[PDB]
Amino acid sequence: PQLHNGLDFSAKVIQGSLDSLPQEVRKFVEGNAQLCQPEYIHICDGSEEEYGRLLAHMQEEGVIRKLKKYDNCWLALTDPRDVARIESKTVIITQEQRDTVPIPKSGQSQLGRWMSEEDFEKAFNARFPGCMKGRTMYVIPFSMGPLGSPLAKIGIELTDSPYVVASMRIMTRMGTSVLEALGDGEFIKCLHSVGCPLPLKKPLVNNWACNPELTLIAHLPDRREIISFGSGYGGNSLLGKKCFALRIASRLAKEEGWLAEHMLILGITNPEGKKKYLAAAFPSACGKTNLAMMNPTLPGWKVECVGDDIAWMKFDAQGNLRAINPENGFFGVAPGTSVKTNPNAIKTIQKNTIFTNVAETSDGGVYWEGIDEPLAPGVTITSWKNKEWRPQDEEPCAHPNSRFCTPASQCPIIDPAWESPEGVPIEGIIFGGRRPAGVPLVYEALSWQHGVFVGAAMRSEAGKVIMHDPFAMRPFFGYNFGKYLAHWLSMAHRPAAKLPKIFHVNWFRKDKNGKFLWPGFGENSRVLEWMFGRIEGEDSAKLTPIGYVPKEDALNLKGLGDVNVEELFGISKEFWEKEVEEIDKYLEDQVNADLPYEIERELRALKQRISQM
Ligand SMILES: O=C(O)CCP(=O)(O)O
Ligand SMILES: [Mn+2]
Ligand SMILES: [Mn+2]
Ligand code: NA
């Protein structure tokens, strides 16, 4: 309907048709075109042609550089103001604050950031009107999870960033077939703008459009909407990555009886052909990608990657905990990725990969701190800041949060079931963190409820600072963490549910001198072997106040040197008295009225067991 000419955006569509879009998709696209005023609308088809052309166009405009050493690899260097997810500008909108975050007893909440609907509407009106003037609005239809999966969920992302389009093609399954699969079904509304309408009011830095001062990443779970403004970077712009897959999804999971978790998924096979799938939640910088793509040292063992970041998990009718990786690629921290640390990642990123904020070598290759391979004499480096770089320099050549964005299918050890619509059966869940002192290499929770507590109690070294990161979900809870705990605990009361064994690992315990007590990397397969046997009901465990640890001689330590098993598995009453006390204070403050009875009980139990040693 029109008395004039200015609501139908059909004349502005440069690929696809508004008419062919499902009713509700058209309304989403058109309504936002009316608001943001793009010059053009491009309905993404996800084709190789679309992709290659968009890359070459970004290359034309100096937005990306081609890396000539590799096969179809690209490099983007950002405005230094726009280099990471910004938690302090990340918010969830609900009617009641308590539905989003528990109300703390003493201080400020570390478990989320609530914004009122009233405050958001003002913030929105101050940002989005006219924001895409002079730019193309790209419409990205994407599936989170295998296209056929009953566990999968579909989104539509509108963006004015070609970089976002290119990265979303890698990180999700996107294009025409998603629109066709969707039909008149429900979808998550994802709206993004770099917030730099043309003509530019402010200087463009490093050909990277962004609006740091107005950056805001919002989630409206009740409206099924993600709305993000001002950042073109990673988690802020690739709206499938954290906004959808963790924040919105955890809330949907809560409603629908499943789990959306910050977990890798791997499949491990023993030398007798028996295969098990495990999930693991680690905070930042704890070797998550390393574990997911591990090359095991133990003969006859195999490790295969399903995913390295997000797990969507639901018990089936038979009581199996079925998991899918909702992503289509890996968005990994580049620095520290070497042949020693992650050889399978090295093989993956050789081809069809977008790199962000890494150094470039003079022969068109990539470089970063901790890459652990020398350059031929003559090969020079250009840093992520587009300046000549030298190993003697005080500044890093790559940004510490620099990234590779690579197709999952390219992983040489990608699991054969990684896109099976039914998902894979999880038999073990692993929590862990960086703890230089006190916390043994591996322990097993005494029960499901103790296991939930272990997840709740997670702390990790960020003078250094040890901080809480329960379930590795601290920046990602879609709703009240106490209710999230209650949601986990409720799984035990599902009849037929086969509850996975819960373990906790510490690869990072140091001796008195500051030296790691565990070699790690591929040797972590020895810990995985113990876990495997424990799931199989093997008598390989010793009871301690914190859970079960390996018996003496239970862990395969052959081929290692003289590993200090005494200091590695040592548990001190003094350390754990302090540990349980600060967990108690943290939970009381941060979770307060919403702490489930069973978590308090697990806490009392632990205090009691420690009091008796
Ligand atoms: O969201 C981002 O930009 C970073 C993703 P991660 O924190 O999993 O490396
Ligand atoms: Mn992550
Ligand atoms: Mn119970
Ligand atoms: Na740039």
From Swiss-Prot:
One GO BP annotation of this record: gluconeogenesis
Cofactor(s) it depends on: Mn(2+)
N6-acetyllysine found at: K68, K69, K89, K464, K512, K515, K585
One Pfam family, short name: PEPCK_N
Residues with Phosphothreonine modification: T176
UniProt-reported outcome of changing H468R: Destabilization of the closed state of the omega-loop, resulting in decreased capture rates for the weaker binding substrates associated with catalysis in the phosphoenolpyruvate to oxaloacetate direction
SUPFAM superfamilies the record matches: PEP carboxykinase N-terminal domain, PEP carboxykinase-like
Binding site for GTP: A285, C286, G287, K288, T289, N290, R403, R434, F521, G522, E523, N524
Record-stated family: Belongs to the phosphoenolpyruvate carboxykinase [GTP] family.
NCBIfam families: PRK04210.1
Protein name: Phosphoenolpyruvate carboxykinase, cytosolic [GTP]
Phylogenetic classification of the source organism: Eukaryota, Metazoa, Chordata, Craniata, Vertebrata
